[PDB]
């Protein structure tokens, strides 16, 4: 099937700063990926983003009742829906499971990679650090970065490249808003 | 600090529509257009809130009308296919005989039409699979998740097979134990 496709998108966005103290509403219309017209609550009228959207801005801006609907959106739409969903979105906290296992940069060489697998947490902001015998190791650290699982949980792997010596204790330390104290997991050579 | 987006689309000639709410990149719910039901991404969401699915149907009807208008205005300029990036990963560190989930992440593509197949040892599997709807990105492409619960063994290999009009051949992304 090589028939041409045509896509229309609309995104009505509510941006919240300090709870619902500062709220910005954006009404955005797109043809394929091209935003052609938008309403920005900072402005209070539709403005064409590209030439394609000039007719829509002029026509919609002539509808005072429509504009007054959009000017009230920060209250009647954004703040309202925030109050509806806040208890299970804004306030969602799911602490991570932390697992440490060894691996190899080269399948034939010996174990020279410590993986700190941090799984199932929400929200996304997290800090993961490596320690060798109580001292933070910042060199040789590589990560997948933040991974969305698509089910309101995140994961991340933080890997430390190192040659373990007998005696050493490695610590992976996780901080996250769901925790009141750092979560640490040790690994011994 | 937080962003809630009500994202809609309508696609011709497929006559596909979609209506969803996003919170900080996660789906709160979408509306099943054929059943006219609100589908909460986590079931527990539905006990703390509701949504009248009819409102989505009304918006999608306007989006359809606007697509026809904008198609004309553009002189029937079609969308350019953007093929996806595909990643396969597991929900949690893998241990033999301990239940887990394979995640197939399909990212950065348009249009929102895709064929996805899970393969176990080269054979299609459908038992217990699930998927998300098309999820919006900030660059206005799409992403999507497909899920396969599985029991890790050393005998089974897996692939996520993704077809998309922007790809010349199907994209296969492999997973196996280790």
């Amino acid at each position: 099937d090589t028939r041409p496709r045509f896509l229309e998108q609309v995104k009505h966005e509510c941006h919240f700063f300090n709870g619902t103290e500062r709220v910005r509403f954006l009404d955005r219309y797109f043809y394929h990926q091209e935003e052609y017209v938008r309403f920005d609550s900072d402005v209070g009228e539709y403005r064409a983003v590209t030439e394609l959207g000039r007719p829509d801005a002029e026509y919609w801006n002539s509808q005072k009742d429509l504009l007054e609907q959009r000017r009230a959106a920060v209250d009647t739409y954004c703040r309202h829906n925030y109050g509806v969903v806040e208890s299970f979105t804004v306030q969602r906290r799911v602490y991570p499971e932390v697992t440490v296992y060894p691996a190899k940069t080269q399948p034939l060489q010996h174990h020279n990679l410590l993986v700190c697998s941090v799984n199932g947490f929400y929200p996304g902001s997290i800090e993961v650090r490596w320690f060798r015998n109580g001292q933070e190791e910042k060199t040789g650290v590589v990560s997948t970065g933040l991974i969305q699982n698509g089910d309101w949980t995140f994961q991340t792997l933080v890997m430390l490249e190192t040659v373990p010596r007998s005696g050493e204790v490695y610590t992976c330390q996780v901080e996250h808003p769901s925790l009141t104290s750092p979560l640490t997991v040790e690994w011994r050579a | 600090e937080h962003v809630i987006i009500q994202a809609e689309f309508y696609l011709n000639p497929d006559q596909s529509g979609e209506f969803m709410f996003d919170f900080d990149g996660d789906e709160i719910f979408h509306v099943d257009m054929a059943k006219k039901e609100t589908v909460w991404r986590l079931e527990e969401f539905g006990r703390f809130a509701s949504f009248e699915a009819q409102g989505a149907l009304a918006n999608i009807a306007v989006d359809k009308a606007n697509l026809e208008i904008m198609t004309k205005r553009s002189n029937y300029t079609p969308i350019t296919n953007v093929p996806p990036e595909v990643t396969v990963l597991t929900n949690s560190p893998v241990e033999l005989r301990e239940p887990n989930v394979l995640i197939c992440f399909i990212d950065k593509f348009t249009p929102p039409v895709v064929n996805v197949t899970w393969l176990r040892n080269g054979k299609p599997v459908t038992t217990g699979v699930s998927e998300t709807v098309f999820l919006p990105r900030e660059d206005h492409l799409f992403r999507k998740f497909h899920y396969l619960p599985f029991l890790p063994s050393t005998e089974d290999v897996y692939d996520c097979r993704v077809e998309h009009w922007g790809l010349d051949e199907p994209l296969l992304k492999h997973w196996e134990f280790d």
């Binding site: 609309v10 009505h12 009404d27 007719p55 829509d56 026509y59 919609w60 509808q63 429509l66 609907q69 959106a73 009647t76 739409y77 309202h80 829906n81 509806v84 969903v85 | 009500q6 809609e8 709410f21 709160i28 719910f29 703390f48 809130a49 509701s50 949504f51 009248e52 409102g55 989505a56 009304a58 918006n59 306007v62 989006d63 009308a65 606007n66 208008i69 904008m70």
Partner: peptide
Amino acid sequence: ETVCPRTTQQSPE
């Protein structure tokens, strides 16, 4: 308790 939709409006023809 009810999430409220923002309506979309029709472009000029």
